[PDB]
Structure formats: C-alpha cells, structure tokens
Enzyme design. Structure first.
Site, PDB file in Angstrom:
ATOM      1  N   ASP B  13       0.545  -1.223  -0.016  1.00  0.00           N
ATOM      2  CA  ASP B  13      -0.023  -0.052   0.109  1.00  0.00           C
ATOM      3  C   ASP B  13       0.745   1.278   0.029  1.00  0.00           C
ATOM      4  O   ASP B  13       2.164   1.231   0.543  1.00  0.00           O
ATOM      5  CB  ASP B  13      -0.907   0.127   1.016  1.00  0.00           C
ATOM      6  N   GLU B  15       0.571   5.683   0.525  1.00  0.00           N
ATOM      7  CA  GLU B  15      -0.098   7.026   0.529  1.00  0.00           C
ATOM      8  C   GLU B  15       0.490   7.890  -0.304  1.00  0.00           C
ATOM      9  O   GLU B  15       1.766   7.785  -0.670  1.00  0.00           O
ATOM     10  CB  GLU B  15      -0.239   7.558   2.240  1.00  0.00           C
ATOM     11  N   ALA B  16      -0.331   9.279  -0.672  1.00  0.00           N
ATOM     12  CA  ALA B  16       0.346   9.982  -1.553  1.00  0.00           C
ATOM     13  C   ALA B  16      -0.299  11.467  -1.253  1.00  0.00           C
ATOM     14  O   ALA B  16      -1.263  11.678  -0.613  1.00  0.00           O
ATOM     15  CB  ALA B  16      -0.007   9.526  -2.953  1.00  0.00           C
ATOM     16  N   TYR B 124      -4.356   2.701  -9.255  1.00  0.00           N
ATOM     17  CA  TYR B 124      -3.272   3.936  -8.588  1.00  0.00           C
ATOM     18  C   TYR B 124      -2.125   3.255  -8.189  1.00  0.00           C
ATOM     19  O   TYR B 124      -1.198   3.920  -8.877  1.00  0.00           O
ATOM     20  CB  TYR B 124      -4.131   4.107  -7.395  1.00  0.00           C
ATOM     21  N   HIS B 183      -6.057   4.450   6.072  1.00  0.00           N
ATOM     22  CA  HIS B 183      -5.223   5.396   5.451  1.00  0.00           C
ATOM     23  C   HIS B 183      -3.858   5.750   6.029  1.00  0.00           C
ATOM     24  O   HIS B 183      -3.394   6.914   5.977  1.00  0.00           O
ATOM     25  CB  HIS B 183      -6.027   6.704   5.066  1.00  0.00           C
ATOM     26  N   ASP B 188      -3.484  -0.193   5.940  1.00  0.00           N
ATOM     27  CA  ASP B 188      -4.427  -0.614   4.913  1.00  0.00           C
ATOM     28  C   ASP B 188      -3.598  -2.196   4.237  1.00  0.00           C
ATOM     29  O   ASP B 188      -4.290  -2.924   4.053  1.00  0.00           O
ATOM     30  CB  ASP B 188      -4.168   0.286   3.604  1.00  0.00           C
TER      31      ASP B 188
HETATM   32  O1  LIG Z   1      -7.626   9.102  -4.396  1.00  0.00           O
HETATM   33  C1  LIG Z   1      -6.701   9.085  -3.390  1.00  0.00           C
HETATM   34  C2  LIG Z   1      -5.909   8.082  -2.966  1.00  0.00           C
HETATM   35  C3  LIG Z   1      -5.909   6.869  -3.772  1.00  0.00           C
HETATM   36  C4  LIG Z   1      -5.270   5.463  -3.484  1.00  0.00           C
HETATM   37  C5  LIG Z   1      -4.027   5.732  -2.698  1.00  0.00           C
HETATM   38  C6  LIG Z   1      -3.947   6.948  -1.901  1.00  0.00           C
HETATM   39  C7  LIG Z   1      -4.823   8.103  -2.214  1.00  0.00           C
HETATM   40  C8  LIG Z   1      -4.606   9.095  -1.587  1.00  0.00           C
HETATM   41  O2  LIG Z   1      -3.038   9.324  -0.668  1.00  0.00           O
HETATM   42  C9  LIG Z   1      -5.121  10.440  -1.654  1.00  0.00           C
HETATM   43  C10 LIG Z   1      -6.329  10.304  -2.579  1.00  0.00           C
HETATM   44  C11 LIG Z   1      -7.095  11.450  -2.928  1.00  0.00           C
HETATM   45  C12 LIG Z   1      -7.004  12.595  -2.248  1.00  0.00           C
HETATM   46  S1  LIG Z   1      -7.822  14.337  -2.625  1.00  0.00           S
HETATM   47  O3  LIG Z   1      -9.481  13.818  -2.648  1.00  0.00           O
HETATM   48  O4  LIG Z   1      -7.752  15.289  -1.236  1.00  0.00           O
HETATM   49  O5  LIG Z   1      -7.264  14.866  -3.932  1.00  0.00           O
HETATM   50  C13 LIG Z   1      -5.529  12.829  -1.423  1.00  0.00           C
HETATM   51  O6  LIG Z   1      -5.446  14.057  -0.830  1.00  0.00           O
HETATM   52  C14 LIG Z   1      -5.175  11.638  -1.000  1.00  0.00           C
HETATM   53  O7  LIG Z   1      -3.779  11.577  -0.400  1.00  0.00           O
HETATM   54  O1  LIG Z   2      -9.269   7.541  -1.692  1.00  0.00           O
HETATM   55  C1  LIG Z   2      -8.392   7.840  -0.844  1.00  0.00           C
HETATM   56  C2  LIG Z   2      -8.098   8.849  -0.279  1.00  0.00           C
HETATM   57  C3  LIG Z   2      -8.934   9.959  -0.490  1.00  0.00           C
HETATM   58  C4  LIG Z   2      -8.580  11.425   0.166  1.00  0.00           C
HETATM   59  C5  LIG Z   2      -7.615  11.442   1.059  1.00  0.00           C
HETATM   60  C6  LIG Z   2      -6.828  10.394   1.393  1.00  0.00           C
HETATM   61  C7  LIG Z   2      -7.123   8.993   0.732  1.00  0.00           C
HETATM   62  C8  LIG Z   2      -6.199   7.961   0.921  1.00  0.00           C
HETATM   63  O2  LIG Z   2      -5.087   7.997   1.940  1.00  0.00           O
HETATM   64  C9  LIG Z   2      -6.421   6.696   0.471  1.00  0.00           C
HETATM   65  C10 LIG Z   2      -7.458   6.669  -0.397  1.00  0.00           C
HETATM   66  C11 LIG Z   2      -7.756   5.053  -1.220  1.00  0.00           C
HETATM   67  C12 LIG Z   2      -6.945   4.284  -0.818  1.00  0.00           C
HETATM   68  S1  LIG Z   2      -7.335   2.494  -1.626  1.00  0.00           S
HETATM   69  O3  LIG Z   2      -8.685   2.836  -2.549  1.00  0.00           O
HETATM   70  O4  LIG Z   2      -6.161   1.679  -2.456  1.00  0.00           O
HETATM   71  O5  LIG Z   2      -7.950   1.715  -0.368  1.00  0.00           O
HETATM   72  C13 LIG Z   2      -5.718   4.263   0.216  1.00  0.00           C
HETATM   73  O6  LIG Z   2      -5.019   2.975   0.393  1.00  0.00           O
HETATM   74  C14 LIG Z   2      -5.622   5.425   0.649  1.00  0.00           C
HETATM   75  O7  LIG Z   2      -4.695   5.490   1.519  1.00  0.00           O
HETATM   76 MN   LIG Z   3      -3.718   3.698   2.106  1.00  0.00          MN
HETATM   77 MN   LIG Z   4      -4.344   1.833  -1.048  1.00  0.00          MN
END
Ligand SMILES: O=C1c2ccccc2C(=O)c2c1cc(S(=O)(=O)O)c(O)c2O
Ligand SMILES: O=C1c2ccccc2C(=O)c2c1cc(S(=O)(=O)O)c(O)c2O
Ligand SMILES: [Mn+2]
Ligand SMILES: [Mn+2]
Ligand SMILES: O=C1c2ccccc2C(=O)c2c1cc(S(=O)(=O)O)c(O)c2O
Ligand SMILES: O=C1c2ccccc2C(=O)c2c1cc(S(=O)(=O)O)c(O)c2O
Ligand SMILES: [Mn+2]
Ligand SMILES: [Mn+2]
EC number: 3.1.11.2
Lengths: 223, 222
Positions: B13, B15-16, B124, B183, B188
């Site tokens: 997994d 985060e981003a 992703y 998250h 995760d």
């Molecule tokens: O869709 C994601 C996502 C999807 C899969 C892994 C990680 C992330 C994720 O880390 C994330 C996402 C959207 C936003 S958003 O709604 O604020 O633009 C975030 O800020 C953000 O951190």
């Molecule tokens: O959509 C998000 C998201 C949206 C807004 C802020 C933060 C996140 C986020 O942190 C995130 C998300 C999805 C996944 S997932 O679809 O791969 O389970 C993640 O693992 C993950 O860490």
């Molecule tokens: Mn995650």
């Molecule tokens: Mn994820």
C-alpha cells in the site's frame, strides 16, 4: 554531550537460536526509526496508570525473518514461534551481504547522528549483531551509529520519578497496567520498547544523548 | 499457469499527495512479504462472521515515510495524517536512488517468482509506483516482479460465496468489524492481508492465474 543530540532513535530487537553460551544466530530482526521530534511530540503521560501512548505517525519500520545456520533450541522455537526448518521451507535467506546492504540503505534514510536503542542490548542484541556483521565481506553498516541499552535508561527514569524486575514485560506492565502484545517477536518487542520509551520522552532523550556510545566499540558475542 | 506459481506475495500500500489528476507523489509505502506456504497455512474461516485471521508468524515488513516534492492536498493531509512540512522537519528523504536500492535488497530476500498484491493497484498504486521509479537513474527494482489487483480477486471470491469494493467495505462484509488505522500504508496493508487470508487457497490460485509483469504497468503520468 559526548556526540551531540541524537536526531534519530532506532528501536531494535532480535530473536535468535538460543542463549549466548550456544553461540546463537539471529532468526528475526526489527528496526523502528523515529525522529527525536516524533518522540518529544508524544503528549505527557497523565493518569495512574496512563494510557499506552500512541506510536508517532511518522515512523520507518523494517522487520525481517532470517534463516540461521544452526537449529533453534527447543526453548527458542517454542517462545519465538520460529524454527530453522520452517524458516527454510519459507525460503528465508541467511544473515548475508545483501542484508547488510538493506540495513545500510535503511539507515541512510535517517538523519544523523542516529542511536540504536535495545532492551538488554549491551549484553545480548549489540554483541550478537556485531558478531553477525563481522562474518560478512561487506563493511559494517553500523560503524557510524551510536547505541544505548534501555534497561539502564528506565532504571534512571524510574529512580527519579520515585526491588523491581527490569524485564521488558515487567517495566511495560508497571507503567501501563497492561500485558505486552506479541512478546518474543522482534516487531512486538520493539513496539513494547517504543511504548516504555514514550513514558517520559524528554527525559528518555536526554538520557540517550548523555549515554550514547559508538556501536563500533561493542565487542562481538563470540568470534 | 502464465508465469508458474508465485512463491512470495508482497502486499503493498501507498499514501500520496492527492488524486491521479493531480500528478501525485508517494508519501508512505508499506511492503509485507509472505511466502505462499504462510498463506496456505492460515486455518480455514469457520463461523459467520469468521474471526479476523491471525497474520502468519513468518513475515518480512518494510514501512517508510517519504518526503514528496510537492505539498499534500488538504484532503490527503487530513485523511493520511501526513504533510510535506512535517515529513521534512522529521528529515524524511525523497523517493530517490537509495530508496530503490533499499527496495531491491528487500525484494532480493524473497523467493521468486514474486507478486505484488495491491487494492486498486491497477488504477493507482502500480501506475504511481512505475512513475516514481521511472524518474530515477537506477533501473527499476520491480522489473522481474509480477503484480495483481486484489479488487478483481475479491470480486471473484465473494461472487462465488450492489456491493462496495472499497478496502474497508470488503473487510467489514467479511469480518463484521471496522478496520484499524485506515489510510496509513501499514494499516491498509494489514487490512488487505486479512481479507486475502479469507480464502487463502482460492486467493493464491487467482493470483497465480492473473499475475502479470510489473514492467507492463503503464506510468500514471510522464
Ligand atoms: O484518491 C486518493 C488515493 C487513492 C489511492 C491511494 C492513495 C490516495 C491518496 O493518498 C489520496 C487520494 C485522494 C486525495 S484528494 O481527494 O484530497 O485530492 C488525497 O488527498 C490523497 O492523499
Ligand atoms: O481515496 C483515498 C483517499 C482520498 C482522500 C484522502 C486520502 C485518501 C487515502 O489516503 C487513500 C485513499 C484510497 C486508498 S485505496 O482505494 O487503495 O484503499 C488508500 O489506500 C488510501 O490510503
Ligand atoms: Mn492507503
Ligand atoms: Mn491503497
Ligand atoms: O535469554 C534469552 C534471550 C535474552 C535476551 C534477548 C534474546 C534472548 C533469546 O533470543 C533467547 C534466550 C534464551 C533462549 S533458551 O531458554 O531456549 O536457551 C533462547 O532460545 C533464545 O532465543
Ligand atoms: O529471555 C528471553 C527468552 C528466553 C527463553 C526463550 C526465548 C526468549 C526470547 O525470545 C527473548 C528473551 C528475552 C528478550 S529481552 O530480555 O531482550 O526483552 C527477548 O527480546 C526475547 O526475544
Ligand atoms: Mn529483546
Ligand atoms: Mn524479542
């Protein structure tokens, strides 16, 4: 301060094949790296007992299972849940050159100076790790790293807030009135150690800064 | 069949900083490596709901916080608990050449063939990781590694047994419990491990059938 302020604490634990007299070998290793800021930011412990502190959000963690060259004693296997046979059938490699490269790259991600913190590290973990590293063709990744035993630290800390057991579990339970989770796993024991070090974070840091010594001066368990 | 039996599953997994359209950067990465034997050894799920399975004893784990080059969006920071400023003040390094060396040496400890397993990885995690690695001067450590998306896997498995396929919704459906530490990369990954341990044999077989080279994953952005 002998070597200035430690910027990273790396909580370390090992599982192994047996007691020192057995010339033991590491079966599991966990490193948990925490910036000094993360430690000083854990909110002060109030209540009696205080809640087990929250781990800092920003951590780096590494946990590895390692196939020993010799069998685990019956005691080791029972309490650690690891054996040579099982490690090997799950394709675990030996403590080797690639492992040292992995450790080096992990350490390089941490601000210096960096200090290893291990419970009873001065008598078991540090000498054993030195022995394991000395057998490699790769130079020690720990040569510029500092180290400290958390037994002495908690003796000092508890002395001051105020005969007691200083086993990892006894300390944890005394502080938090809770049994440790996943004891005798490398990762489980690291997390317990983190929790006890978070008890009085500032005092713990100061003690560490005062007592940190070069890992390069740790004598090998055996040769 | 296509690339023989995967000997190691690496649950992954990330985060981003934001959504794909934002050209996001990784802030946290967790890998959890499990031998296929460790997965087959989790005892069969009995009861309704079954207990959350015990993680295998023998695992390798890597969890790393990573300073991005750009700020996290407000959404990212709130939900992940990470920001650029905090990562930097705690001296976190960028996704760099040394990070790839670290990843390489970690992967080298695992029996091959090896397969990455990530939830929504095809849309992703996998494209983003490809993008991050392509930026480096060191060749990709994932070049001989295989990969699969656990969404499709769990769709198949649960079908055989309209639903949300968010990580938490699947977990809750299977175990009637909220997941912990959502998250966070490691949180995760642990949730994903638990859902993959639901039907270990069937999960492994699906993975063996669908494993594709990571080298064929297209970068999120260029
Ligand atoms: O869709 C994601 C996502 C999807 C899969 C892994 C990680 C992330 C994720 O880390 C994330 C996402 C959207 C936003 S958003 O709604 O604020 O633009 C975030 O800020 C953000 O951190
Ligand atoms: O959509 C998000 C998201 C949206 C807004 C802020 C933060 C996140 C986020 O942190 C995130 C998300 C999805 C996944 S997932 O679809 O791969 O389970 C993640 O693992 C993950 O860490
Ligand atoms: Mn995650
Ligand atoms: Mn994820
Ligand atoms: O006292 C220890 C010990 C102390 C501090 C750190 C680590 C260990 C340890 O790893 C260990 C020990 C004893 C045995 S014994 O009772 O079977 O001979 C083991 O097998 C074993 O692995
Ligand atoms: O005394 C033991 C022990 C005794 C008998 C079998 C197994 C172990 C053992 O596995 C162990 C021990 C101590 C520590 S400690 O003193 O450094 O907290 C450990 O970390 C650890 O893993
Ligand atoms: Mn220990
Ligand atoms: Mn231990």
């Amino acid at each position: 301060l002998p070597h200035g302020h430690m910027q990273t604490l790396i909580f370390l634990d090992l599982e192994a094949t047996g007691l020192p007299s057995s010339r033991p070998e590491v079966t599991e290793l966990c490193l948990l790296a925490v910036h000094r800021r993360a430690l000083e930011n854990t909110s002060i412990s109030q209540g009696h007992p205080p809640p087990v502190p929250r781990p800092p959000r920003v951590v780096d963690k590494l946990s590895l299972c390692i196939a020993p060259g010799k069998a685990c004693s019956p005691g080791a296997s029972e309490i650690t849940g690891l054996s040579k046979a099982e490690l090997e059938v799950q394709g675990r490699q030996r403590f080797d050159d690639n492992l040292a490269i992995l450790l080096r790259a992990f350490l390089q991600r941490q601000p210096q100076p960096c200090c290893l913190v291990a419970h009873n590290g001065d008598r078991y973990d540090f000498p054993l790790l030195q022995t394991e590293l000395a057998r490699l063709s790769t130079p020690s990744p720990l040569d510029g790293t500092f180290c400290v035993d958390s037994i002495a630290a908690l003796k000092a800390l508890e002395q001051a807030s105020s005969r007691k057991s200083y086993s990892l579990g006894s300390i944890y339970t005394r502080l938090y009135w809770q049994a440790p989770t996943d004891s005798h796993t490398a990762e489980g024991d690291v997390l317990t150690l983190l929790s006890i070090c978070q008890w009085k974070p500032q005092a713990l840091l100061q003690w560490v800064d005062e007592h940190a010594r070069p890992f390069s001066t740790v004598k090998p368990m055996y040769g």
